[PDB]
Write a protein that binds this ligand. Structure first.
Ligand SMILES: C/C=C(/C)C(=O)O[C@H]1C(C)=C2[C@H]([C@@H]1OC(=O)CCCCCCC)[C@@](C)(OC(C)=O)C[C@H](OC(=O)CCC)[C@@]1(O)[C@H]2OC(=O)[C@@]1(C)O
Ligand SMILES: [K+]
Ligand SMILES: [Mg+2]
Length: 994
């Protein structure tokens, strides 16, 4: 029964055909179970260990690599491991990488945490029902509860289903429902219907929501909805229906892999068509099986050359280290790839209280009526110092300090503040500061009362722990608080009914003290207090009171205002019914205005600057607040979201205004809006959707489980460190200190990170371009393998992987927050840069094949063949008494492969430095600029020598070291690559726009 809050207790009982005394019959439970299912959210999504690894191998590059391993493996068993038992080495290495990458997947997944699963923490194991088969109450499993059940809850109970309250057995029922409504304090429940079928949850005063807690009391209810139909259930389903898109880099890599298969596929065909002459060859006289093995030794080399096998390790280690750095700056990143999206944020939607502001409220201003005499009216306005909750401060009139007691209107103002107040103070000895007990707003009032000391209590001789509530306590001993009419939002006030306590001075009698939003309260005043006198409420006095309130709330003060008032002749006690807040407005009529208080919830100190950084970085900032629209706007002005004199008619909206627009104009509103006041959790999600319709990258804050769907949906959901576990698990990032400026500092890192990622991605991939060239020339010409997969893998995982991660530590651009957000569709390599790596790749694939061949042709220690057809090396076995007077195993020699492997290594070290900066020459941007980069390069070079010199490894790698001179040639060949990009860098700077 979705609409139970709007129905009476009788109607709900009749809807289900259940007695409040008996509960459901066993039959009814049977039938209700079948119709409505069990009371629980669905079991976790479907992914198993066997399934996990299949997903690890859906990847296109991973798929190609796997295949490569197989061909490698055949080559092993069908080539003599008796000539070289270092042949079964190649197929093995490949497989291993694939295992690591799949183990990466399962460790990451098994340690991941689903937000929908965090919801289930709000499901109690048990619940209590009355059912017909037994007279006394039954403790049963909560999942066995069914709609129509007569349920019982009490102090400490987590509420098992969405329940329409029937009967409150205790004198009062208080509920902690902060997780659903973000109401900080426990709230009173009642039993009467709530008229509006479209009432938001905060106004369903007669409902208990599944997952919340009973803070006090005891009550009997009827279950309205269960399982997926509850409020927390609807939230689960929104989340589950939310597909989170791939990060831009993820997309670009899938793009790469897609295209990389296509290219590789093309290259294979290419190979075979300059070697199409193999068809004009005689059927007999050729070892085909050696020719076919040749196109497969080259096939596996190709797959290995093209794939940046070390890239996922480098990407993840840079993000990891960025993350550690972010966490020292209060930004706790939950999703490693989020760092990139974070740097892309173009819109930040942020809650105000506690993140743009301190949520540390104090009363800064107050006024009472000084005099009313015709059209003449005079106020007494005061100011109050001290911004903390401490009793430290003074009251000032026209900047002069005054004694509050001297003003009759103020002793009454204080007593209203002291009594119309469910909050208090307490002094903490551990932290050494005063702290709030209750709402921030009301606690500001009890602080105000302490500063006013309106009876001049011997306060000087008072200790701190008792100083906290000292002045308040002498007011609480003057009137007896009989009962209180709790705040509700239909009337936006609350009141307390007091009788005179024992009085030495016989009072007028009972009083009601009320405080609330000024408009409503003031309208219900027929009198204004002037000192101890009372005068009828007139126009000039009203306008004067309201004009000041507007000033304080709407100007640079940005103060939240409460009107304070008392009812001098309340209804007779016996004529009041306290079980239905519907009547409380009527009880709070015919009041006398006594004063207004203005309190401030100040911006965090850093928030000013951050809003300006966002302006500088072209990031829109959207405030979401509970303030009225006029004060929301003013607060925006105060923190720089709006200029002080900027016209913001079309950039500010209330939930009410926003809903009243047709869908088209809701969307246009989101294009420019920077302030939403008094919204519904509904709206956060809608706002995100709209912003995504402008292809925005939206960060969005939240902290309750009611925020969870918007967090899930935003590109970056941002949770509060002090918020719910559920909100955190739905977020890409948690703010350890709740501070908005932490968002902005994380966006900065995200940009710095990605820029450095750009460089080592560009670098590794450009190397793979190169390798693919070498492998291509090997096959295209018909040379002995210049490079082997065993070697190429080593280069791609290790020797290039260290400068790659070193480029992760490229110092950041100083203007990195003076540029607009990066387009998510920005290609990593395109246009002109494409040409640059097109050229560099063409170089290294020639350098590597060259040195290998230079060992063969134009040789000092090689066959020394000057310009011979050592492209026909394969047919040297039978054709040696035909052509060669020389040997033939010289074509499987290590030294050519290690000439190639050495020029590859040396080249990439140089190209790492060309990669320190995209276009800045090492003229203006030296290589010492990256401290760690120069360091890492020297380490890989060691590792080069290690596979050249340490007794086990050379045979494994088909390598043999080269003496004092053969390196000169390695350097002759490989060193120039610097001069190439240094030129192409010069070009971009001076000729194309940039
Ligand atoms: C890695 C090895 C190379 C050989 C490769 O195939 O990558 C290609 C391809 C996949 C693209 C190209 C490569 O194409 C070429 O290199 C031209 C053909 C040369 C053939 C080689 C032998 C004849 C990238 C590598 O070329 C340059 C010149 O660097 C740049 C870029 O890659 C990126 O932007 C990096 C993405 C993380 C992509 O054009 C990319 O596809 C597009 O979707 C992008 C945007 O991805
Ligand atoms: K999200
Ligand atoms: Mg919230």
């Amino acid at each position: 029964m979705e609409a139970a809050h709007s129905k009476s207790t009788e109607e709900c009982l009749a809807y289900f055909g259940v007695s409040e005394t008996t509960g459901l019959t066993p039959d009814q439970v049977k039938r209700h179970l079948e119709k409505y299912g069990h009371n629980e959210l669905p079991a976790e999504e479907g992914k198993s260990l066997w399934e996990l690894v299949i997903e690890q191998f859906e990847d296109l590059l991973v798929r190609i690599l796997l295949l490569a391993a197989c061909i490698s493996f055949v080559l092993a068993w069908f080539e003599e491991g008796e000539e070289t038992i270092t042949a079964f080495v190649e197929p093995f290495v490949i497989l291993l990488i694939l295992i690591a990458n799949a183990i990466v997947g399962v460790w990451q997944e098994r340690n991941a945490e689903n937000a929908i699963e965090a919801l289930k923490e709000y499901e109690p194991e048990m619940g209590k029902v009355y059912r017909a088969d037994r007279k006394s109450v039954q403790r049963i499993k909560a999942r066995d509860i069914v709609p129509g059940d007569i349920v019982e809850v009490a102090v400490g109970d987590k509420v098992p289903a969405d329940i329409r309250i029937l009967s409150i057995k205790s004198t009062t029922l208080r509920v902690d429902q902060s997780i659903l409504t973000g109401e900080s304090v426990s709230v009173i429940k009642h039993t009467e219907p709530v008229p509006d079928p479209r009432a938001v949850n905060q106004d369903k005063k007669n409902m208990l929501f599944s997952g919340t807690n009973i803070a006090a009391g005891k009550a009997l209810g009827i279950v309205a909805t269960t399982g997926v139909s509850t409020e927390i259930g609807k939230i689960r389903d929104q989340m589950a229906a939310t597909e989170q898109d791939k990060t831009p880099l993820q997309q670009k890599l899938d793009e790469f892999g897609e295209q990389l298969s296509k290219v590789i596929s093309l290259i294979c065909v290419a190979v075979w068509l300059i070697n199409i002459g193999h068809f004009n060859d005689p059927v007999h006289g050729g070892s085909w099986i050696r020719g076919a093995i040749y196109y497969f030794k080259i096939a596996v080399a190709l797959a290995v050359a093209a794939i940046p096998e070390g890239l996922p390790a480098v990407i993840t280690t840079c993000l990891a280290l960025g993350t550690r750095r972010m966490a020292k700056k209060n930004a706790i990143v939950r999703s490693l790839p989020s760092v990139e999206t974070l740097g892309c944020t173009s819109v930040i939607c942020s809650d105000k209280t506690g993140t743009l502001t301190t949520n540390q409220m104090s009363v800064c201003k107050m006024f009472i009526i000084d005099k009313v005499d015709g059209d003449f009216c005079s106020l007494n306005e005061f100011s109050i110092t001290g911004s903390t909750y401490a009793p430290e401060g003074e009251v000032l009139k026209n900047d002069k300090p005054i004694r509050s007691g001297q003003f009759d209107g103020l002793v009454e103002l204080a007593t209203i503040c002291a009594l119309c107040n469910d909050s208090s103070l307490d002094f903490n000895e551990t932290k050494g500061v005063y702290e709030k007990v209750g709402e921030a707003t009301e606690t500001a009032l009890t602080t105000l009362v302490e500063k006013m000391n309106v009876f001049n209590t011997e306060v000087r001789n008072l200790s701190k722990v008792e100083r906290a509530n000292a002045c308040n306590s002498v007011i609480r001993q003057l009137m007896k608080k009989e009962f209180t009419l709790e705040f509700s939002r239909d009337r936006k006030s609350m009141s307390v009914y007091c009788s005179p306590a024992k009085s030495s001075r016989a009072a007028v009698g009972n009083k009601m003290f009320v405080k609330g939003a000024p408009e409503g309260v003031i309208d219900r005043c027929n009198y204004v207090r002037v000192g101890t006198t009372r005068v009828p409420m007139t126009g000039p006095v009203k306008e004067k009171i309201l004009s000041v309130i507007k000033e304080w709330g709407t100007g640079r003060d940005t103060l939240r205002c409460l009107a304070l008032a008392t009812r001098d002749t309340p209804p007779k006690r016996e004529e009041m019914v306290l079980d239905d807040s519907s009547r409380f407005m009527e009880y709070e009529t015919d009041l006398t205005f006594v004063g207004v208080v203005g309190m401030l919830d100040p911006p965090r100190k850093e928030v000013m600057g951050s809003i300006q950084l966002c302006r500088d970085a072209g990031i829109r900032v959207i405030m979401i607040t509970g303030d009225n629209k006029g004060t929301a706007i003013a607060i925006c002005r105060r923190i720089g979201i709006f200029g002080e004199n900027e016209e913001v008619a079309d950039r500010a909206y209330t939930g009410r205004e926003f809903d009243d627009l047709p869908l088209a104009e809701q969307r246009e509103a989101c294009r420019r809006a920077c302030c939403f006041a008094r919204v519904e959790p509904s709206h956060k999600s809608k706002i995100v959707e709209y912003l995504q319709s402008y292809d925005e990258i939206t960060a969005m804050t939240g902290d309750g489980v009611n925020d969870a769907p918007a967090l899930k949906k935003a590109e970056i959901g941002i949770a509060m460190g002090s918020g719910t576990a559920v909100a955190k698990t739905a977020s890409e990032m948690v703010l350890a200190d709740d501070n908005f400026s932490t968002i902005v500092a994380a966006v900065e890192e995200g940009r710095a990170i990605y820029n450095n990622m750009k460089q080592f991605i560009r670098y590794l991939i450009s190397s793979n371009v190169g390798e693919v060239v070498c492998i291509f020339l090997t096959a295209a010409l018909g040379l002995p393998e210049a490079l082997i997969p065993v070697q190429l893998l080593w280069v791609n995982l290790v020797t290039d992987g260290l400068p790659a991660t070193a480029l992760g530590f490229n110092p950041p651009d100083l203007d990195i927050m003076d540029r607009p957000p990066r387009s998510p569709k920005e290609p990593l390599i395109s246009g002109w840069l494409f040409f640059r790596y097109m050229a560099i790749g063409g170089y290294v694939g020639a350098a590597t094949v060259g040195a290998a061949a230079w060992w063969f042709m134009y040789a000092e220690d090689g066959p020394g063949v000057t310009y011979h057809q050592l492209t026909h090396f394969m047919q040297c076995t039978e054709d040696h008494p035909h052509f060669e007077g020389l040997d033939c195993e010289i074509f499987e020699a290590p030294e050519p492969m290690t000439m190639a492997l050495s020029v590859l290594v040396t080249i990439e070290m140089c190209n790492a430095l060309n990669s320190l900066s995209e276009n800045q020459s090492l003229m203006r941007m030296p290589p010492w600029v990256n401290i760690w980069l120069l360091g890492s390069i020297c380490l890989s070079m060691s590792l080069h020598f290690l596979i050249l010199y340490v007794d086990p490894l050379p045979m494994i790698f088909k390598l043999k070291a080269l003496d004092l001179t053969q390196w000169l040639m390695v350097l002759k060949i490989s060193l120039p690559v610097i001069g190439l990009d240094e030129i192409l860098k010069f070009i971009a700077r001076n000729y194309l726009e940039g």
